[PDB]
Write a protein that binds this ligand. Structure first.
Ligand SMILES: N#C/N=C1\SCCN1Cc1ccc(Cl)nc1
Ligand SMILES: N#C/N=C1\SCCN1Cc1ccc(Cl)nc1
Ligand SMILES: N#C/N=C1\SCCN1Cc1ccc(Cl)nc1
Ligand SMILES: N#C/N=C1\SCCN1Cc1ccc(Cl)nc1
Ligand SMILES: [Mg+2]
Ligand SMILES: [Mg+2]
Lengths: 208, 209, 210, 205, 210
C-alpha cells in the first residue's frame, strides 16, 4: 500500500512540475491574501530609528495550473513542496533597512483545487522612530508590504481581517503591543503609471 | 579494500539512483525522535530579551526505502552520507530571532534497517527574558521545536527521555544549568485545524557564582 | 481558455527569447543606461570610521534589439516580468563603498516589446563619508560615484532624467534631514586604461534632524 | 610542449575523477596546527577567537597514478570540491568557522593529499587570568563529527602547536600551545573516538 | 553590422570556453607570472582592542594564457572582451594574515585581450593583523600584509609588480587616517609544509590619524 501512495505522489509531482508558471499578467491576474502574526518586537534603536520585528506572514493564492483530481492520484488532496519548485509572490517590505532574515523552511503546501499556502517567518529591520515608547501612548510605526514588480493589474492583495494576529506575541518582550493593524492600500511609484497594491502593517507599542 | 569501496558505491547507487522520497504523507506518516544536548548558554541579552544557546540536536527516523540486506553488499551495515542525498525533517524553533547558525558537517548515518541518525550542532538566538539570572532562583525560558509545515498526521515527534543531555555542558560557561527538560506537546496554529507536534525545551539557568 | 492561452503565449515568448539565442555591450554595439536615485533614509553616520549608511532604490533602464518582439505574434503581450538572472544587466557599482551592498528588493526586471528593460533594485550601502558638521545648521556633504566597473564610456554610457534625486519617499522621521541631493553625470579615467569611464555622482547634503 | 602538458593534466584529472572511509577501509588523517593569532577574548560571553591554519594529510589508493603515463606529472592542484575531504570539526565552536584560504588541495601520484585551510574560529573559553602572569588556559578538541576511530584515525607529527608564524604584535602572547591526540569511549557506543586536543595558555602582551 | 558584431563575439566566446575544457591552472611545465599592483582607497578602521585594521583597496591583476589567444581577423576584428571571472581561470591571491574573509566590493568581471592577456581588478575590504600603536603620533603606525597564491609555489606561479609604489591617487581625502607611505615588494617565502619557495607581494603601509 504505502509504496503506491509514495508512487502516486511522485507521479502527481512529476505530472505537475514536468509537463508545464510564468507568473501573473494583465490577462491572467492573481490575488494574494496576506496576514501577519507578530511574535516579537526585538529591538528598537533610537540612535538609527530602526526597529526589528519577528513575525510570520501567511500568504495564499490559487493557480489553475496546480489543480488535480484526487481520484486520479490515490486520493491525494494536498502535498508539501519546496518553494523553489513553484512560483511564489515577491512580497517585499517597502522601508526595510537590512535584507529580511528567513527563520522558517521554504516549503509550501499545495492543495488539489490549486490553492497554495506559504507561511514564512522573518526577522525584519525597518524604518521606525521609537520616540514615545517610554510613554503611555507608546510609539507608532508602519511598514508597507507588497509585490515589488507587479502592479495592481497583475497582483492584487487582500487581507482576511484588518487585525494582526497577536495570539502568539511574546509575553515577556521588552515591548508590549497596544495595537497592530494590517490594511490594504493603493500606491503609485515614479517609474510607472499603474497603481501598485500594498498591505500596511501599523504597530503601536510601548516599553513593558 | 577495492571490493569494499565498490560494494558501498553500489549500495549508494542502488538506493539513490535505481530506486525512487517525497516526504511523509497522511497515508505514510513518519515519527521523528528528537533529543537535545546543551553545550553552552553563550549570551543572555537583557536589552532585547534574546538568549544564545549552542546545542546538538539528535534526530532519528526510519524509512523503508533506505533498507537493505547487508548480505547483498559485503556485510555493509551502515554508511555516512551527505544530508543533501536524503530527505531530512524541517525541525524549526518556533521563537528564534535570527537564522540558526550550523556548526557541524551536514552528514547523516544510514543503517541497513532504514533508520537514519543526524545530529546538527547549532547556535540559536531565541526569545528569552533573563530576569532573575543574577539570583539564586535563576531565569527560566522555553523554546518549542517541531516541523514547520507537517502536521501530526504527517510527522509525529517523540523523545527518548525527558532530560536534556547536560554531560557536555561547558563547565566554565557564564551560566550554569539548574534544570533542562524536553517534552512533547501538541499545538494548533491559526492557518489550519490539524494539530502540530513539538518538543518543548525548558531551561532554568543562572550566572555562575 | 483565454487565461490558459495567455500563459502559453508568454511561456512561448520567453522560450523564443531566452532558450533560442547577448554577450554585453561593445565599442561597436554600445549601450545607454539611464539611472535615477530615490533616497529613502540616511540610517547611520559613523564619525569614528567616516562611513555613512544609506537606503535607496536605483531605477535602471536600457534597451536591447535582441529583446524586441511583435505583440501580435504573441497574443498582444506588450511586456513581462522576468528574473534578472534570465537577462544581461549592467554592473553598476558604487566606487567608494566600504561593505558589499545589501540587496533589499527582488531581483526581477520588466521587459517591454520595444526591447526596453527596467530594473529597480533597492539597496543598503555603506560608503566613505566624513559626517563632520552634521550637528550644525549647514550640515555635512558627502558624495559617492556609481558606474560600470568594467565598461568604458565607449561601451556603456550613463544618462539621468534629472539632476535632482527623488526625495518624495525620504523617511520623514529619519535621524537625518536632507538639505539637498543631486545626481550628476561625470567622466573619469582610471590607472589601468586610457578610455574614459562614465559615472553618476550622488551628492548629499544632510544634518541631524532639528 | 606546454600544450602537451596541459592535455596530460586535463587527461589525468578526467581519468581520476571514493565514498569515504569505512571499518573495512579505514583512513588515518594527519593533523597539525599553526596558530597565527588570538584576535579577541570576550569575558562577557567566554568566547575566544583564533586565527590559524591546519595541515591535513591523507592517502587514497584511488588517487594513485604512474607519472610516466601522464607526461611525468607527479602532483596537481585541485578544488577541494573535486575530492573527498575529512569532516574535521572543532567540538566547542560558538560560530561557524570562517574560511580564510582558497579551498584547493594538492594531490600527489602516490595518492597522498595535502590540504591546508586557514580559519577564524570562535570557541568556548573563559579568559579569566589573561591579565596576570600565569595567564588564561583554554582547550578545544578537533575531530571527525561523524566517523568513529574505526573509520578515521588521527595522527599528529608533534604535540607542539607551530608558533613560528604567531603574530608578533598580537594583543595576547602565547605561554604554550599543545596539540594532543586523545582516544576515548563514550556511554552510547562501543567504538573508540579520536580527537586532537588543542590547549593554549596565553596572557595579555 | 551590430548584429554581426554580437554574433562574432558569441562565436569567439563559444570557441574559447564552450569548445575547450577549462584551463587546469599553471604547472611546473606551464608556469605563469601574475603582475599585481595595489590601489589603496581607505583605511576604514584601526581596532586597538584586537589589533586588526580594515583596508578598502583594489588590486590590478594581469596574466597571459596562450589558450586565450585569437586572431581578431577570424573574429570581426574583436581585439578584447569583458567576461565573467567564473568563465576563466583566475589566480588564488590570498592575504597571509587576514582575520576575516575578504569582502568583495566590485563585479567579478575581467577583460581578455587577443594576445591571451587578462586584466582583473577586484575591489575588496580586508581585515588583517595590525597593531595601530603610534597612529596618534607624528611617526604613525606601520603595518604589513603579504599576498600571493595560497597553493601554487614559485615553480607554478611567479609574481611581479610594475612599481614598488602603492597607488595613492584614489586614497579617500577625508579618511580618519592619512597615508605616510605605502610600498609593494616581491618576496620569496618558505612554508613549513613544503620545500618549494612560494612568492608573495608584501604591502607595507605607514599611517597616522588625520
Ligand atoms: N499560521 C500558521 N501556521 C504555522 S506557524 C508555525 C508553523 N505553522 C504551520 C504551517 C502550516 C502550513 C504552512 Cl504552508 N506553513 C506552516
Ligand atoms: N520607482 C519605482 N518603482 C517601484 S519602487 C517600489 C516598487 N516599484 C515598482 C517597480 C516597477 C518595475 C520594476 Cl522593474 N521595479 C519596481
Ligand atoms: N585601475 C583601474 N580600473 C578601474 S578602478 C574602477 C573601475 N576600473 C576600470 C576597470 C577596467 C578593467 C577591469 Cl578588468 N576592471 C576595472
Ligand atoms: N604550511 C603550509 N603551507 C602554506 S601556509 C600559506 C600557504 N601555504 C602553502 C600551501 C601548500 C599546499 C597546500 Cl595544499 N596549501 C598551502
Ligand atoms: Mg483599498
Ligand atoms: Mg577523492
Amino acid at each position: 500500500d504505502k509504496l503506491h501512495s509514495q508512487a502516486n505522489l511522485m507521479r502527481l509531482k512529476s505530472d505537475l512540475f514536468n509537463r508545464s508558471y510564468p507568473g501573473p499578467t494583465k490577462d491572467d491576474p492573481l490575488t494574494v491574501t496576506l496576514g501577519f502574526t507578530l511574535q516579537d518586537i526585538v529591538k528598537a534603536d533610537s540612535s538609527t530609528n530602526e526597529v526589528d520585528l519577528v513575525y510570520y506572514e501567511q500568504q495564499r493564492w490559487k493557480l489553475n495550473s496546480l489543480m488535480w483530481d484526487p481520484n486520479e492520484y490515490g486520493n491525494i488532496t494536498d502535498f508539501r513542496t519546496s518553494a523553489a519548485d513553484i512560483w511564489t509572490p515577491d512580497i517585499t517590505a517597502y522601508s526595510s533597512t537590512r535584507p529580511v532574515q528567513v527563520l522558517s523552511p521554504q516549503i509550501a503546501v499545495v492543495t488539489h483545487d490549486g490553492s497554495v499556502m506559504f507561511i514564512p517567518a522573518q526577522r525584519l529591520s525597518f524604518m521606525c522612530d521609537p520616540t514615545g515608547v517610554d510613554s503611555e501612548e507608546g510609539a507608532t510605526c508602519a511598514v508597507k508590504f507588497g509585490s515589488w514588480v507587479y502592479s495592481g493589474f497583475e497582483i492584487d492583495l487582500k487581507t482576511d481581517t484588518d487585525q494582526v494576529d497577536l495570539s502568539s506575541y511574546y509575553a515577556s518582550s521588552k515591548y508590549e503591543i497596544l495595537s497592530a493593524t494590517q490594511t490594504r492600500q493603493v500606491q503609485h511609484y515614479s517609474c510607472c503609471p499603474e497603481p501598485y497594491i500594498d498591505v500596511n502593517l501599523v504597530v503601536k507599542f510601548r516599553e513593558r
